[PDB]
């Protein structure tokens, strides 16, 4: 066909024209691409063709310059200049001119003379460009869609090009920005163009900035453009108080008091919601400069010196001027609202929430008037943002001085929970959410708790707007009411705890409501779960038999959910189907912790066959997997050696999942469940222990896998030696090498995932040469003579430890390990080792470490370790 | 056994001290805020020591 | 919006990577270390700071 006519071939009647296109220019563009675009810029730069060619005709000069890819941009770009160096020599200037061409189509023209300098000038290329532009607007003899498309240009260029890479020449373009800004500019279009602009720039006007002398002059700028009539502005200007207030908060001492209180203010009241947005942003910007600069604070205090920057607590300040206008913004509510739609009356209850974490204490005295107040109102909006206030400053005040408040809430939130309004019923949910989160004591009071509970059991067959907080609701309240029957728990768990008398009708309403023909609405069915887990792990021993017949219902449901795979037909039904199905063994996993060991058995054979089949069958998956070895390994820690008889019916999976290496997450669970079967089986787990130590130190040596992945092997060895014993000797040879290997192992410690890495490596190895010693050593009282073979040893393991002692990038878990070590090592051979720590100091202020160190683990083996390297002082 | 993953007690006695109380979700924040600030501050800091090294530390013949 | 998971990502997001995933009550692990790894080599700096402040205001006109 032609040019003019082909890339106007997509505004016609025909599916198949609608390609007309997308195939003739694309398969012609990679043929001659440098002359593809260069013949475009030929239509754009033509005045005569329509809006349809013209445009059409910089998109695809666009698109071939540009996409919003990390990796595909960084590409094209090389490619344009790749390209003739004579090919783009007319199109830098063929484009450039088209620049105040049309009305408001040339507009295009703005999204090529950006990309393209957005690659020729990390080259230091096109110097005919920047000053172009500028003087394009400093010339008091220029048109507005010249200016307007030109500033556009300018603008897409601070957007998309690496700020470092013109962090040079900014004053020339500040200038051109500033000037398409001052109040004279007839064309409100043409100031937008320009604000819009210096909000891409701000970034790297930091030079700017710093220099009183121009700064007052952008200030000025940008307040008065907040004032021009033409909203469009109004909102970009108050765009630019919102981001220079979050980059430049330490000059805004000057500007706050006199204008910008002023202005955002009003803005925060403008029944315009695209502005009343950017006021209620303005403060929340300052909210977290000022929580950032209270870190600040507390910590140049203990550093002697004094803070870098200060605040000079304007969000305090404005607390009486804000909460009202915030407070009355929660009342322009939206009845239809299903909506992932922000607007005025969100921003305000986060705001609110945000001021509550700030200025915490201070903010009720300004808030509780108008809870008060509303909490009556005949209107719902009010009722409703009265609770919604009350909510939402339960985070930040100190607990002692909510709870009492909240304790005389708490009937009247019983009773706006049978409100009439769907609305106040969300929001009250979710309130009382807040309060049994963040105040479980006065939630779980027994004032009210009978009442409280009685309504929640009800609130869950609500909407999927209000159940959902419900569910929330009682997941903090089970753990509450568990850490609170915490003296009433004797032997290491509760013999009961205050919502035995409803448990199982809890449990009973929630497996229901796990049910939801509507469970999709609102994740109502994932929070259904997640509560109904989080009401079996914090469950006090004397609801026992309601958990029971809560597992049959669970392995009824993973059993019809596993036949009920084959009837998958959208894309959707698929992730819904995992989703359900992870869930399930989720909720299999908490359920098995709680059953007394005579409960799993009988569970056992049920259980394992959904599994066995749920890993067999389901072997096209890859996420299913890492789910069923995870209730296995809870399965095999429940049964301990009962476990024995699944382990043939099994093996070939720890198989698949030990070998497979692509989706180390798989393959760590397998690792682990490895260790959780030295511990179950033992001795007896001898049969596979040849194909698992090899299959092992196979991954150990293929560097294809994921290095997480080997430390936890390493580890596993010493599982291994502990459950096998003296047979371990067979593998004692290579294992203690590799340990040596792994030992010896170096990073740059200037890689912080290299800290963590080389000490998760450190702490691996000292856990497998603790497990070998023990393993040896076995364990009558009499140190079998195995333990001897390590005895060479010795010398080199006392060593690395040392290296540590020395490296301060340590890790109290690290210290831990190796307190312990050494702990064992003097109770295997004990003389030798006495003197070779005594020749190496370092390790004793490491013990000590060890000591006065807040952690555990670290404290008690420092502890032995010293007492047992003392008793061998006064042996000879 | 009870503090392994829900001992967000040792997450908290760093960012707040053991002195005080606080939930969850409220420790989490306050350890997201400061991890943020310490990223800052030390970036600050580097970009610092960058300049009392590569700047007059050297050459006086 | 914010539950205890979406910040623990957040976290994820924060001390590891971007998107690559480790479990839960493996991130507080991390974050724990890491804010402790970072105070120490903050306060490192601080100091080699102050040592090219000192014995380099001395050299000057």
Request: charged share 25%; aromatic share 6%.
């Amino acid at each position: 066909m032609e040019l003019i006519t082909i890339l106007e071939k997509t505004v016609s009647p025909d599916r198949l024209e609608l390609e007309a296109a997308q195939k003739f220019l694309e398969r012609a563009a990679v043929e001659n691409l440098p002359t593809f675009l260069v013949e475009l810029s030929r239509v754009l730069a033509n005045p005569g063709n329509s809006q349809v060619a013209r445009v059409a005709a910089g998109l695809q000069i666009k698109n071939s310059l540009t996409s919003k890819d990390p990796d595909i941009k960084a590409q094209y770009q090389q490619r344009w200049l790749a390209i003739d160096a004579n090919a783009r020599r007319e199109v830098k200037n063929y484009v450039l001119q088209t620049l105040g061409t049309e009305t408001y189509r040339p507009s295009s023209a703005s999204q090529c003379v950006a990309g393209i300098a957005c690659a020729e000038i990390p080259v230091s290329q096109w110097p005919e460009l920047i000053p172009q532009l500028v003087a394009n607007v400093t010339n008091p003899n220029s048109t507005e869609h010249m200016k307007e498309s030109t500033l556009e240009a300018i603008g897409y260029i601070c957007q998309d090009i690496d700020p470092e890479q013109l962090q040079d020449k900014s004053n020339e373009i500040l200038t051109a920005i500033i000037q398409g800004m001052r109040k004279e500019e007839p064309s409100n279009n043409v100031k937008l163009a320009a604000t819009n602009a210096l909000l891409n720039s701000l970034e790297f006007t930091k030079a700017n900035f710093d220099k009183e002398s121009e700064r007052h002059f952008i200030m000025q700028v940008v307040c008065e453009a907040t004032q021009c009539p033409d909203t469009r502005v109004r909102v970009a200007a108050l765009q630019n108080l919102v981001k220079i207030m979050s980059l430049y908060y330490q000059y805004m001492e000057t500007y706050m008091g006199p204008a910008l209180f002023a202005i955002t203010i009003e803005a925060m009241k403008s029944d315009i919601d695209e502005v009343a947005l950017q006021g209620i942003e303005f403060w929340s910007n300052v909210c977290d400069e000022e929580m950032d600069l209270a870190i600040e604070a507390s910590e140049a205090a203990e550093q002697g010196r004094p803070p870098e920057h200060t605040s000079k607590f304007y969000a305090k300040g404005a607390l009486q001027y804000l909460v009202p206008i915030l407070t009355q913004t929660l009342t322009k509510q939206d009845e239809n609202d299903d909506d992932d739609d922000w607007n005025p009356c969100k921003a305000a209850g986060v705001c609110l929430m945000l001021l509550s974490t700030c200025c915490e204490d201070d903010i009720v005295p300004h808030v509780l008037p108008f809870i008060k107040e509303h909490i009556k109102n005949p209107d719902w909006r009010y009722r409703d943002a009265a609770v919604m206030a009350f909510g939402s400053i339960l985070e930040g005040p100190e607990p002692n001085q909510l709870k009492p408040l909240v304790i005389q809430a708490m009937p009247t939130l019983i009773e706006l929970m049978k409100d009439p309004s769907v609305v106040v019923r969300d929001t009250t949910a979710w309130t009382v959410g807040r309060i049994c989160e963040l105040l479980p004591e006065a939630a779980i009071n027994d004032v009210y708790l009978a009442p409280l509970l009685q309504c929640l059991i009800e609130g869950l067959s609500a909407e999927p707007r209000v159940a959902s907080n419900v569910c929330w609701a009682f997941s903090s309240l089970a753990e509450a009411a568990y850490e609170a029957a915490d003296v009433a728990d004797d032997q290491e768990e509760p013999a009961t705890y205050c919502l035995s008398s409803s448990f199982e009708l809890i449990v009973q309403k929630l497996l229901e409501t796990t049910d939801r023909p509507d469970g999709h609405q609102n994740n109502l069915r994932s929070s259904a779960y997640e509560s109904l887990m989080e009401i079996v792990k914090n469950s006090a021993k004397d609801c026992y038999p309601a958990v029971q017949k809560t597992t049959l219902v669970i392995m009824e449901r993973l059993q019809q959910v596993l036949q009920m795979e084959s009837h998958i037909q959208s894309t959707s039904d698929r992730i819904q189907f995992n989703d359900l199905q992870s869930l399930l063994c989720a909720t299999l996993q908490n359920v098995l912790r709680k059953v007394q060991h005579q409960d799993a058995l009988q569970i056992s054979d049920v259980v394992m066959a959904s599994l066995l089949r749920m890993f067999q069958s389901t072997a096209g998956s890859g996420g299913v997997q890492e789910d069923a070895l995870m209730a296995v390994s809870t399965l095999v820690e429940v049964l301990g050696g009962e476990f024995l008889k699944y382990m043939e019916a099994f093996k070939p999976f720890l198989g698949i999942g030990l070998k497979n290496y692509a989706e180390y997450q798989v393959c760590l669970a397998a690792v682990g469940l490895v260790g959780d079967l030295c511990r179950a089986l033992q001795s007896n787990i001898l049969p596979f222990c040849d194909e698992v130590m090899q299959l092992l130190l196979e991954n150990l040596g293929n560097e294809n896998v994921h290095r997480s992945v080997k430390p936890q092997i390493l580890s596993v060895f010493g599982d291994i030696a502990l459950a096998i014993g003296g047979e371990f000797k067979k593998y004692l040879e290579v294992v203690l090498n590799t340990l040596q290997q792994a030992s010896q192992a170096q990073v740059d410690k200037s890689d912080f995932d290299m800290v963590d890495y080389l000490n998760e490596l450190r702490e691996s190895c000292l856990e497998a040469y603790t497990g070998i010693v023990q393993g040896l050593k076995g364990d009558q009282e009499n140190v079998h003579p195995d333990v001897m073979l390590v005895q060479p040893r010795v010398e080199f393991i006392l060593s690395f430890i040392d290296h540590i002692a020395g490296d301060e990038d340590h890790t109290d878990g690290v210290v831990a390990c190796a307190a312990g070590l050494i702990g064992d090592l003097c109770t295997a051979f004990g003389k030798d080792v006495l003197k070779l720590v005594e020749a190496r100091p370092m390790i004793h202020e490491l013990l000590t470490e060890g000591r006065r160190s807040k952690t555990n683990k670290a404290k008690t083996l420092a502890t032995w370790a010293t007492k047992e390297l003392r008793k061998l002082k006064n042996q000879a | 056994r009870s503090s392994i993953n829900d001992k967000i007690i040792e997450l908290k006695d760093l960012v707040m001290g053991t002195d005080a109380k606080m939930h969850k979700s409220g420790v989490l924040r306050k350890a997201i805020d400061y991890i943020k600030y310490l990223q800052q501050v030390n970036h600050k800091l580097r970009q610092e020591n960058m300049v009392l090294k590569l700047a007059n530390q050297k050459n006086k013949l």
